[PDB]
Amino acid sequence: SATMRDGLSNLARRLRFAMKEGSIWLGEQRMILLHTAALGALRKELVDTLGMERARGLFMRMGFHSGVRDAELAKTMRSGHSDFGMLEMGPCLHTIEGVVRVTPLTVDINIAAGVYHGEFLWEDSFEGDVHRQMFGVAQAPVCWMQIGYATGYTSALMGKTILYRELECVGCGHPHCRILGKPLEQWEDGEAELALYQPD
Amino acid sequence: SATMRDGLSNLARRLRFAMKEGSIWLGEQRMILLHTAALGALRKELVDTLGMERARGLFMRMGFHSGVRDAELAKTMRSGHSDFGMLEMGPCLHTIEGVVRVTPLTVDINIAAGVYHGEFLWEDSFEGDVHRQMFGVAQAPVCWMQIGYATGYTSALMGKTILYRELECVGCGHPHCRILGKPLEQWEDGEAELALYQPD
Numbered sequence: 290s291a292t293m294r295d296g297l298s299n300l301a302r303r304l305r306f307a308m309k310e311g312s313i314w315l316g317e318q319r320m321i322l323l324h325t326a327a328l329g330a331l332r333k334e335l336v337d338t339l340g341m342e343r344a345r346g347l348f349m350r351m352g353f354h355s356g357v358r359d360a361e362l363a364k365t366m367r368s369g370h371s372d373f374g375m376l377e378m379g380p381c382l383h384t385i386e387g388v389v390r391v392t393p394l395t396v397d398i399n400i401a402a403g404v405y406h407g408e409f410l411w412e413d414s415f416e417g418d419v420h421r422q423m424f425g426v427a428q429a430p431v432c433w434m435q436i437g438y439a440t441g442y443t444s445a446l447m448g449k450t451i452l453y454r455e456l457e458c459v460g461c462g463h464p465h466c467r468i469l470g471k472p473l474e475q476w477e478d479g480e481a482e483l484a485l486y487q488p489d
Numbered sequence: 490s491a492t493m494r495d496g497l498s499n500l501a502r503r504l505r506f507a508m509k510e511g512s513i514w515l516g517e518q519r520m521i522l523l524h525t526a527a528l529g530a531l532r533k534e535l536v537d538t539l540g541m542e543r544a545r546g547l548f549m550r551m552g553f554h555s556g557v558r559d560a561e562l563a564k565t566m567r568s569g570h571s572d573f574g575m576l577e578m579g580p581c582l583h584t585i586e587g588v589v590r591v592t593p594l595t596v597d598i599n600i601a602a603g604v605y606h607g608e609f610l611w612e613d614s615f616e617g618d619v620h621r622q623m624f625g626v627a628q629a630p631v632c633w634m635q636i637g638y639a640t641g642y643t644s645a646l647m648g649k650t651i652l653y654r655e656l657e658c659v660g661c662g663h664p665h666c667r668i669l670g671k672p673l674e675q676w677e678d679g680e681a682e683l684a685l686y687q688p689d
């Protein structure tokens with residue numbers, strides 16, 4: 290809509306169901322369909338036994354790994370795309386994966402120059418949704434794995450550390466989630482946010 | 490595949506992809522497509538920090554929740570379907586979800602009478618594959634989520650606890666995985682396996 294529409298159709302054709310081998314492929318990566326309620330039960334177990342902040346890191350890093358892999362897929366489809374066209378593939382794959390409906394708001398990107406400032410709308414976040422099913426409204430944003438995805442995708446695409454934060458979140462009782470991504474240097478508590486992406 | 494193509498077709502009508510709202514639904518359960526490499530990363534951190542047995546518990550229970558939800562879906566499609574044809578939806582759903590290719594070996598089931606004896610072949614288990622990439626070959630079977638699913642699905646379908654175990658597995662170097670399920674009592678170590686399906 291309109292680049293989103295082409296993006297979605299372009300990338301949705303890389304998604305493949307190999308039922309003969311019990312497998313689902315997205316580009317070169319094997320995928321599974323997982324119940325959000327099952328992932329939600331795991332999350333509750335982690336939060337109850339390891340604590341909110343350790344569980345938050347576990348999921349952010351899982352999201353990070355997903356993002357890096359989708360960026361590797363986006364790179365194989367470089368041919369004939371602007372830097373924005375390649376960036377947009379992240380929102381599209383996240384949407385195709387059923388994780389969240391992503392709408393890019395303002396995107397400033399130039400990979401060779403190391404330029405990146407990105408704001409995105411998130412609707413129907415599976416994560417904020419299922420977190421609020423189990424813990425009720427939280428006070429801090431809670432789409433941990435989703436934020437990890439954006440951070441991994443964009444960092445892999447730019448070749449430098451790009452961190453994201455939710456400025457608004459359904460898990461906090463907002464109409465929607467809203468995110469901002471920019472280089473580590475432009476974040477007040479940057480090195481504390483980067484620390485979350487390393488194994489504890 | 491004879492009764493399996495039927496189930497696979499019949500149950501594919503229940504899988505809805507809507508990039509319109511960034512969601513995916515299987516029956517009345519919301520799903521996400523998740524990279525097995527991302528699930529692998531999570532598993533590595535859980536095993537390394539919590540220990541292999543406590544991590545095994547978390548994955549078995551996540552699988553259990555998935556299997557229970559899918560048995561709920563199979564129940565809504567019992568219109569003219571024998572006990573076996575309903576049992577079979579489990580292996581079908583597992584395959585559609587890209588977890589593993591399942592082939593029923595021999596299945597004895599009567600839901601009314603509380604009798605169940607079932608043996609299955611597992612080809613291309615995602616879980617065994619990703620485990621050997623994160624840890625190398627393991628000494629004991631490793632398809633934890635996949636076993637939880639079988640246990641949860643069958644138990645919910647029978648209305649009695651049906652436990653499974655892997656008699657062989659790719660995670661141990663074998664060409665494929667192979668499993669056996671029967672009622673709790675009929676396992677000499679049944680009650681201890683049951684302990685694994687309960688959170689702290």
Ligand SMILES: Cc1ccc(O)cc1
Nearest residue numbers: 379380383391409439
């Ligand atoms: C770059 C990006 C990727 C995913 C996402 O949800 C938002 C933005």
Ligand SMILES: Cc1ccc(O)cc1
Nearest residue numbers: 579580583591609639
């Ligand atoms: C009943 C069942 C369900 C799933 C599976 O993988 C095997 C057997």
Ligand SMILES: [Zn+2]
Nearest residue numbers: 417432458466
């Ligand atoms: Zn959110």
Ligand SMILES: [Zn+2]
Nearest residue numbers: 617632658666
């Ligand atoms: Zn196995």
